[PDB]
């Protein structure tokens with residue numbers, strides 16, 4: 001019941017920055033899990049569970065997107081301690097985040113970028129469908145179940161309930177924030193999310209982020225350091241339109257020509273992951 005009597009805590013999974021998520025095992029079925037600890041002091045937003053329970057906005061969002069659609073890691077359970085909250089997330093194995101996968105292999109082939117990007121679109125679409133706005137989409141925040149070839153969205157620590165009115169706060173990755181935020185400190189969930197999706201896509205086909213300085217973000221000019229098809233370039237410039245209203249809707253993104261004939265997760269794994277090449 002306590003916690004330490006249920007899961008067998010393992011090695012720290014972090015490896016790069018703050019945060020404290022260890023590799024756990026669930027005694028009973030020895031199911032692979034991830035124990036993420038969050039200090040109460042460093043908790044900006046708090047939310048009430050369906051039964052009015054003071055809890056971190058992260059636990060609220062996770063439970064709302066938790067169920068079946070494997071697009072996002074599911075919160076299996078949580079615990080509260082005097083100064084922190086412990087979260088038990090499902091942990092795929094083998095696993096590797098998009099960022100390490102990109103650093104290791106560099107720019108991804110378009111076919112593979114199509115399967116991957118598609119999967120996160122489905123996951124983000126799932127989040128909005130449950131009243132959740134991630135706010136921190138980036139290669140670091142997505143995992144790869146290497147056997148199934150399925151990407152899992154993680155870290156809702158900057159998330160927020162999805163609203164149709166403006167947002168005046170943003171505690172996510174700067175370089176992924178839209179020009180609206182940088183220039184006015186205000187944005188709208190869905191269109192900002194599309195902008196981060198634009199950075200991400202570029203990051204997949206170019207091996208790196210397109211912008212680095214507020215100036216570049218505000219100018220919105222996109223230069224390709226790698227051979228990228230015209231279609232993919234068009235989808236990217238489109239998601240990266242300065243004026244929010246000009247960004248494509250999630251439906252337009254998935255109907256976009258470059259987005260057609262996406263591979264299935266298993267096919268993708270079988271072709272781009274399974275092989276030790």
Ligand SMILES: Nc1ncnc2c1ncn2[C@@H]1O[C@H](COP(=O)(O)OP(=O)(O)NP(=O)(O)O)[C@@H](O)[C@H]1O
Pocket residue numbers: 013014016017018019020021033034036073089090091092095097140143154155156157
């Ligand atoms: N379910 C999981 N399965 C496997 N690894 C995980 C899982 N959740 C988190 N990790 C690892 O733990 C790291 C931190 O996860 P994260 O959700 O981002 O917490 P954080 O406290 O917000 N740290 P950070 O965002 O880097 O400042 C990730 O980069 C992953 O390597």
Ligand SMILES: [Mg+2]
Pocket residue numbers: 140141155
């Ligand atoms: Mg993170």
Ligand SMILES: [Mg+2]
Pocket residue numbers: 155156157158
């Ligand atoms: Mg976080």
